[PDB]
Structure formats: C-alpha cells, structure tokens
C-alpha cells in the first residue's frame, strides 16, 4: 500500500506497511536456463584442469 | 481479506504526543520479524525479533 505514518514520542515518525491492494503473489527471481546451464558447463570445464 | 501467506497484522498500542493516555495502532509485519514470546500455549502474544 504505502508508508503508513505512525507517530511515536515527540516528533519520531516511523513508516510501516499498510494493507495490500489486489491479490497476493510470490516474490521471485528469474534466471535463464540455457545460459545458466552452459555457464556451469564452462565453470566445470575450467575447474577440471585443477582436478584431473 | 482472504489470507496473506507472509504478513501478520500485529495490532499494538502506542504512546501519543502526551504521556498519560495510549492509542491503538496497527501495521502489517513480515513473518521472519515476529517471534512468539510464550511460556504457555498462546498463539496471539507475539513480539518483534529486535527486543532480545
């Protein structure tokens, strides 16, 4: 929603979460699969030099 | 409304601009910030993870 202003003491105003407008959904992160796969493949290729 | 998987309501009383009387406020806090102080089986007596 917003920074709901709640006042404590003489002048201190802290900001806390109000409601949630709409439906709730997950907070996520997205990484491409083929780029991550051949990135791990290249990391394994390079690290196989140090382990025979 | 409905049910949020991560947010508790956590209504608390707080000090107004005068010391004598108290007022009731509310927010919505996240689940990993809220700890159940409990010496019994009480499911509504919660506190912040700060004050320890």
């Amino acid at each position: 929603n917003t920074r709901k202003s709640v006042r404590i003491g003489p002048g201190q105003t802290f900001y806390a979460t109000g409601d949630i407008i709409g439906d709730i959904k997950q907070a996520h992160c997205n990484i491409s699969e083929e780029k991550w796969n051949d990135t791990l493949q290249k990391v394994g290729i390079e690290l196989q030099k140090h382990f025979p | 409304s409905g049910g949020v998987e991560e947010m508790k309501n956590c209504s608390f009383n707080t000090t107004t601009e005068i010391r004598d009387k108290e007022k009731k406020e509310y927010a919505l806090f996240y689940k990993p910030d809220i700890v159940p102080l409990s010496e019994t089986n009480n499911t509504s007596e919660y506190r912040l993870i700060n004050c320890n």
């Epitope: 407008i21 709409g22 439906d23 709730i24 959904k25 997950q26 | 409304s1 049910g3």
Partner: antibody
C-alpha cells in the same frame, strides 16, 4: 465443453438478502478467477469484484463497502454471492464470468478478459 | 471516477465502415493497455470480441479491429451485415484491481 450455470430466478422483498449461485463445469475452476457483473433491465453494465477460488481472496468495487460477500467451496465447484440490504434500485440480472489465469507470479486479477458467462438470474424486489 | 463516456447509438448501411470509440481518463485507458470490447444480443449473455488492446480471439472472423490513441480507444468495423445489430460495451483496467465498464452503444442496420 466449458459451461457456467446459475440458480433460478428469485423474487424478494426490500431489506432482505439474496443468494446467487454459479456452478463451473468442464475445467479446473481452482486455476481461474471469477468476476461478477450486474445488468439492470434497460441500462448498462456494472462491475462487482472478483473471487479467487484457491485462497478465497476477494475484492469489491466502490459504493458497496462490504455489503456483499462472496464465498466458494472446492467440493461441488460452485461460487456463492450473499448480497444483503436489498433495495428497489438493485432490480437487475446477475452474471458470473470467468476471468484471467491464476499464475502465482503476477497479479492477473484486474484483467477484463471474460469468455464464458452464465445464463443469468433475474432478481426483482417489490 | 464514473463510467467511460460512450455514444448513445450508431447507424450505418451494410457494407459501410463504422467506427465506435470510447474515451477515458489517464488512469483508465491512458496508462494500461487492457481495453476489451464485448457485444450482446438483447436477451442474451455478452460475448468477448477483442483481447487486451488489439488482439482477436479464436472463432472470430477477421472483421473487428480495435486500437487506442492516448486517452481514447476505438473499434473499427468494416463490412457490416444484419447480424451485427447488438449492444457494444467498453471496459478497462481502472487501477487498484478494479474494472470500469463503458456506457454502451446500440448498432442500427439499414
């Protein structure tokens, strides 16, 4: 195929409460939103809020203020409206429509994409 | 925050291009691209005819084209027959998870 059926026509008195049902058949109803619209006879269309059949989340339009409650059950695949404090202005026809797709990663509630509708219940008051 | 403005009725000969437009504020049409259009026969349930702003659904002949320009969204129909006599409505994403429907037109054939 995909069908939406509702209850019969209901005649009531002012100040009472009306209940309109809507049964969804042909698809998994727990993955789609369901919106409710209102049609007065001879007027346009008015929109009431949506119901999420998974977690029971609701929204409502303005000038209603929680005087209508929408609930659902996952056993018989039927959505429910409980509208209270009836008035002579509320003589209309109520439709239930299928909305967007529940996706767990973005808010698809406000998407005005209504494909399938019920045949509608006529609610008249004296 | 009322309904979207809409003409009361339209008229047109068969084979004549007819344009229907509805106007909204900056928070309804000018900021979100979710503007759909519905028709209904009198006495029957409404039916979807246009997706988000310009896409056509399945089972629909390529005759209804929708477009938007600023705060105005318009639907253009060419090649009209007697089966297009219906009531046409606008809708949009109004923000804060709310949907506002349009006033509605009536199409008269000649």
């Amino acid at each position: 195929q995909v069908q939406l059926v509702q209850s019969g026509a209901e005649v009531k008195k002012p100040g009472a409460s009306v209940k309109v049902s809507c049964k969804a058949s042909g698809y998994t109803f727990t993955g789609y939103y369901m919106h409710w619209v209102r049609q007065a006879p001879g007027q346009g269309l008015e929109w009431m809020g949506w119901i999420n059949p998974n977690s029971g989340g609701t929204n409502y339009a303005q000038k209603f203020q929680g005087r209508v409650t929408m609930t659902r059950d996952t056993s018989i695949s039927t959505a429910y409206m409980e509208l209270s404090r009836l008035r002579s202005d509320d003589t209309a026809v109520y439709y239930c429509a299928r909305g967007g797709w529940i996706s767990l990663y973005y808010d698809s509630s406000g998407y005005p994409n209504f494909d399938y509708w019920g045949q509608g219940t006529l609610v008249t008051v004296s | 925050q009322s309904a979207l403005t809409q003409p009361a009725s339209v008229s047109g000969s068969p084979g004549q291009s007819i344009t229907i437009s509805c106007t909204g504020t900056s928070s309804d049409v000018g900021s979100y691209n979710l503007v759909s259009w519905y028709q209904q026969h009198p006495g029957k349930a409404p039916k979807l005819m246009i997706y988000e702003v310009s896409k056509r659904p399945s089972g629909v002949s390529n005759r209804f084209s929708g477009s938007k320009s600023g705060n105005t969204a318009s639907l253009t129909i060419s090649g009209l027959q007697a089966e297009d006599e219906a009531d046409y409505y606008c809708c949009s994403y109004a923000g804060s998870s709310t949907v506002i429907f349009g006033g509605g037109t009536k199409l008269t054939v000649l």
